[PDB]
Structure formats: C-alpha cells, structure tokens
Amino acid sequence: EAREAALRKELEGVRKINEVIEGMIGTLERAKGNMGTVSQTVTNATTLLNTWTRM
Amino acid sequence: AVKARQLAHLHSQLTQLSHNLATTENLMRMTAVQAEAMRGLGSWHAGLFMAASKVL
C-alpha cells in the first residue's frame, strides 16, 4: 500500500533526524564537559596569577 | 743630559697622568652607576626569593 510506503519513508527520514539528534546531544554534552574543564583551567590560571600578584 | 732626563721623567709622568685620570674619572663614574644598578637588581631578586619563602 501507498500508506505503508509513506509510513516507512516517514520512519526513515525521522529516524535519520533522530540519529543526527542523538549525535548532536552527545556532542553538546561532550562540549559541556569541555567547558567545565575550561572553567576549571581558567580558575586555576587566575589563582596562579593572584599568587604572582602577592609575590 | 741631566735636564734631558728630568724632562723625560716629567713627560712620562704627565703623559701617563692624563691617561690615568681619563681611566679614573670615566670608569669611576660609570662603575658607580653600574653599582647602583646591580644594587637594585639584587635587591629585587632577594625580595623575590623572600616572597617565594612566604609562598612555601
């Protein structure tokens, strides 16, 4: 049936979108951890700079 | 001969005197400046290590 063709094509396109979405959310959470590391890094940098200041 | 040697001594004296005074004045003033430069330098580094000790 034409409805089955529409059904399968709908699942195909939406599933491609879902897979891309899954990779996208994974990318974002990876970036979340990266930004956390970034924040910690600069925090430590600031600490060292303050140590230098007192020095 | 006698006065020839007298003035030989005098010429040597005065010649080397001009040399020595040049040496003296120029390098003394220079070294005085160098001394104060080294003074401030070493004092700064001394305090640097002082702060390092307090950092410990």
Task: Name its key features.
part of a larger assembly, 2 chains, A: 55 residues, mainly alpha, 1 helix, 96% helix, rod-shaped, B: 56 residues, 0% strand, nuclear protein, dash
Structure description:
The structure is cut from a larger assembly and holds chains A (55 residues) and B (56 residues). By secondary structure, chain A is mainly α. Chain A has 1 helix and no strands. Chain A is 96% helix and 0% strand. Chain B has 56 residues and is mostly helical. Chain B contains 1 helix and no strands. The interface between A and B is small, with 3 and 4 residues. Chain A: Keywords: Cell cycle, Cell division, Centromere, Chromosome, Chromosome partition, Coiled coil, Cytoplasm, Cytoskeleton, Kinetochore, Microtubule, Mitosis, Nucleus. Chain A: It is found in: Nucleus; Cytoplasm, Cytoskeleton, Spindle pole; Chromosome, Centromere, Kinetochore. Chain A: Belongs to the DASH complex DUO1 family.
Please summarize what this structure is.
Chain A: Keywords: Cell cycle, Cell division, Centromere, Chromosome, Chromosome partition, Coiled coil, Cytoplasm, Cytoskeleton, Kinetochore, Microtubule, Mitosis, Nucleus. Chain A has 55 residues and is mostly helical.
Q: Note the total helix count of chain A.
A: 1
- Taken in chain order, the helices and strands of chain B follow as H
Round the Cα radius of gyration of chain A to an integer and report it. Answer: 24 Å
In whole angstroms, the N-to-C terminal distance of chain B is 78 Å
Count of runs of 4 or more consecutive helical residues of chain B: 1
Structural class of chain B: mainly alpha
